[PDB]
Design an enzyme around this catalytic site. Structure first.
Site, PDB file in Angstrom:
ATOM      1  CG  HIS A   7      -0.339  -0.099   2.511  1.00 17.81           C
ATOM      2  ND1 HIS A   7       0.311   0.939   3.077  1.00 17.81           N
ATOM      3  CD2 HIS A   7      -0.244  -1.159   3.408  1.00 17.81           C
ATOM      4  CE1 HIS A   7       0.844   0.525   4.234  1.00 17.81           C
ATOM      5  NE2 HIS A   7       0.446  -0.740   4.439  1.00 17.81           N
ATOM      6  NE  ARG A  61       0.981   1.958   7.702  1.00 19.73           N
ATOM      7  CZ  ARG A  61       1.817   2.387   8.655  1.00 19.73           C
ATOM      8  NH1 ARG A  61       1.654   3.561   9.259  1.00 19.73           N
ATOM      9  NH2 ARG A  61       2.880   1.656   8.975  1.00 19.73           N
ATOM     10  CG  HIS A 107      -0.436  -5.350   4.637  1.00 22.91           C
ATOM     11  ND1 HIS A 107      -1.060  -4.237   5.015  1.00 22.91           N
ATOM     12  CD2 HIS A 107      -1.433  -6.215   4.217  1.00 22.91           C
ATOM     13  CE1 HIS A 107      -2.356  -4.405   4.991  1.00 22.91           C
ATOM     14  NE2 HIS A 107      -2.625  -5.589   4.460  1.00 22.91           N
ATOM     15  CG  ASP A 108       5.238  -3.266   5.988  1.00 28.68           C
ATOM     16  OD1 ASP A 108       4.370  -4.062   6.487  1.00 28.68           O
ATOM     17  OD2 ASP A 108       5.630  -2.155   6.513  1.00 28.68           O
TER      18      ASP A 108
END
Length: 407
Positions: A17, A20, A300-301
């Site tokens: 993503h 954020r 995600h990471d």
């Protein structure tokens, strides 16, 4: 450019993503500094409008790249069958998916896919949280200790200069935390591995875990273009690198450690492999065409770190201190040579920290960063980076945890 006769047939993009707001702002986080944390313009955990724009800039890059290599059409909107997005349930990943489509295919009427119920974990991304499989608490301890090469209780000693630097950026000595415990950041908060009863939740506590979170937050502040980043206290590239080293270490221990990586990464690894052409079974993505050319997975990471740990890939990113930055992606490509032999290639594609901060346009002439990746287990991988698919398939099927396959 690729070897003579080589044709790109199919891409799988596993992307983090976009930028954020911090996922949470705890009391400890506030107490370790006398400075006030800056307000974000969105709810905690949401992608920012700028995060969306950044992602769309990457989608623009992918468009130009996939047009060059013949995989997408020049000018024309792609057919809907050609592009497919599967996003995790979170606002940040769904909106990442949407922003990718807006950059890849501006004014094309395309939409993302995601799990129907967004209030429940998607087992593709979080098989452990979704209750597909579970880990043993004692084997987690051992695997993490193995990965660190040292007892976790001694971890802070590996990172003294980094912790000291995090301490000055925070002004930790003059903080509330220190008036409530009266002061050294490392001594005050020794490292420990904490796991719940279930073995379903695992965290690195103490200074290195806390500093990993803080360092990422500072990077995101910079990527967001906030007026003040770490209260003005990060001045040099050396300091960025030294802060983010805490974050990459935390990720190595909590998400690359192969025992953990395979419990969390098995469904994605199997899905990626199958999209690439491996004969291995996998839960189908709904409504995906056999003729799909571009699969974009918005996660995600932790997902990228999981895949990294399973396949043994490592890297460092020129101009980007976070190894798993906002919008950075693993891009798996299926190539066939002129005898029809299929290979896999893998790149880590990302924006440099300056590309994020400046919102730089990404084009063939001014590209995103990109690192060609070695897969150590693929001993027949060519010097120019192609891994035969038949080999890549075996590699995957040996790395997966069968108890974490999506039944």
């Amino acid at each position: 450019t690729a070897p003579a006769g080589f044709q790109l047939e199919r891409v799988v993009i596993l992307s983090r993503h976009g930028v954020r707001a911090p996922t949470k702002m705890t009391q400890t986080m506030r107490d370790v500094t006398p400075h006030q944390w800056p307000e974000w313009p969105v709810k905690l955990g949401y992608i920012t409008p700028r995060g969306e724009h950044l992602i769309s800039l990457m989608g623009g890059f992918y468009r130009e790249r996939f047009q060059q290599q013949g995989l997408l059409p020049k000018d024309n909107c792609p057919t809907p069958d050609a592009v497919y997005v599967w996003a995790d349930v979170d606002q940040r990943t769904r909106k990442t998916g949407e922003a990718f489509l807006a950059g890849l295919a501006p004014q094309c009427d395309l939409a993302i896919h995601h799990q129907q119920n967004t209030q429940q974990a998607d087992p593709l991304f979080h098989p452990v949280k979704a209750g597909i499989c579970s880990m043993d608490k004692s084997q987690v301890h051992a695997a993490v200790e193995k990965q660190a090469g040292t007892p976790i209780e001694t971890l802070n000693q590996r990172y003294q200069a980094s912790l000291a630097l995090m301490s000055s950026v925070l002004d930790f000595p003059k903080s509330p935390y220190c008036q409530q415990h009266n002061c050294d950041f490392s001594q005050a908060m020794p490292s420990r591995l904490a796991i719940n009863d279930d073995g379903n939740k695992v965290a690195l506590e103490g200074a290195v875990g806390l500093a990993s979170t803080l360092a990422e937050i500072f990077l995101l502040e910079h990527a967001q273009g906030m007026p003040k980043v770490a209260w003005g206290n990060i001045h040099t590239e050396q300091q960025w690198n030294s802060l983010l080293k805490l974050h990459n270490a935390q990720f190595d221990l909590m998400s690359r450690t192969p025992y953990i990586a395979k419990h969390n990464g098995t469904p994605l690894l199997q899905t990626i492999a199958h999209a690439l052409g491996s004969n291995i079974t996998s839960r189908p993505l709904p409504d995906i065409s056999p003729d799909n050319k571009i699969l974009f997975i918005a996660g995600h990471d932790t997902n990228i770190a999981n895949i990294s740990g399973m396949l043994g890939m490592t890297w460092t990113l020129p101009g980007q201190p976070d190894n798993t930055p906002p919008g950075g992606a693993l891009v798996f490509e299926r190539w066939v040579d002129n005898a029809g032999k299929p290979y896999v290639s893998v790149n880590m594609v990302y924006q440099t920290l300056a590309q994020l901060h400046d919102q730089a346009p990404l084009t063939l002439q001014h590209p995103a960063g990109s690192v060609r990746l070695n897969i150590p287990g693929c001993s027949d991988q060519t010097p120019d980076g192609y891994c035969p698919l038949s080999t890549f398939s075996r590699l995957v099927s040996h790395s997966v945890e069968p108890a974490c396959q999506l039944p």
